[model samples]
Target: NRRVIAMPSVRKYAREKGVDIRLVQGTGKNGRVLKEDIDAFLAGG
Candidate 1:
């Protein structure tokens, strides 16, 4: 997970997509958005 793009990176994408963000469940180390988490969210999982 530490190999992910990082939280701020995820925030940037979310902001670009106009996502509510908080409405999504993060899959990082501590409920954060690992790259996979963002990918999962984007995939509609």
Candidate 2:
């Protein structure tokens, strides 16, 4: 939808709920959501 789903484990969870998600980029404590990361996924990572 437009929410942040960083953890793959969590991503799987969202998928199960019939909510297709596009994980937002992050620069968190673990560099878990760098902009490039989301961009890459958007571009078919």
Candidate 3:
């Protein structure tokens, strides 16, 4: 089950991108985890 506040669009994309929702520290307010945040964790930061 999804443990983070992820939109279905983002959730599914994150899935394909192999990024864990729980592990991603979202940059959005109110628990809104966007794809940019996903790219951060998955990418070399």
Q: If scored against the real structure, what TM-score would every candidate get?
A: 0.56, 0.31, 0.72
The digit string of per-residue lDDT tens for model 3 on 1-45 reads 746777787788778988777778677887677888788788884
lDDT, residue 12, candidate 3: 83
Q: lDDT: which is higher, 1 or 3?
A: 3
lDDT of 2 by residue, 1-45 (tens): 544536675466445554334544455565465444545545563
Model 3 alpha-carbon miss at residue 5, Å: 1.2
- What TM-score would you give candidate 2 relative to the actual structure? 0.31
Point out the higher-scoring one by TM-score: 1 or 2. Answer: 1
* Candidate 2: pairs in clash: 26-33
Q: How far off is residue 20 in model 1, in Å?
A: 2.4
Best by TM-score: 3
lDDT of 1: 0.64
Candidate 3: where are CA atoms >4 Å away?
Answer: none
TM-score of 3: 0.72
- Candidate 3 minimal-lDDT segment of 10 residues: 1-10
lDDT of 1 at 31: 76
Q: Kindly list the per-residue Cα lDDT of model 1 for residues 1-45, writing each as its tens digit.
A: 335334787778777776645655676676776656666777772
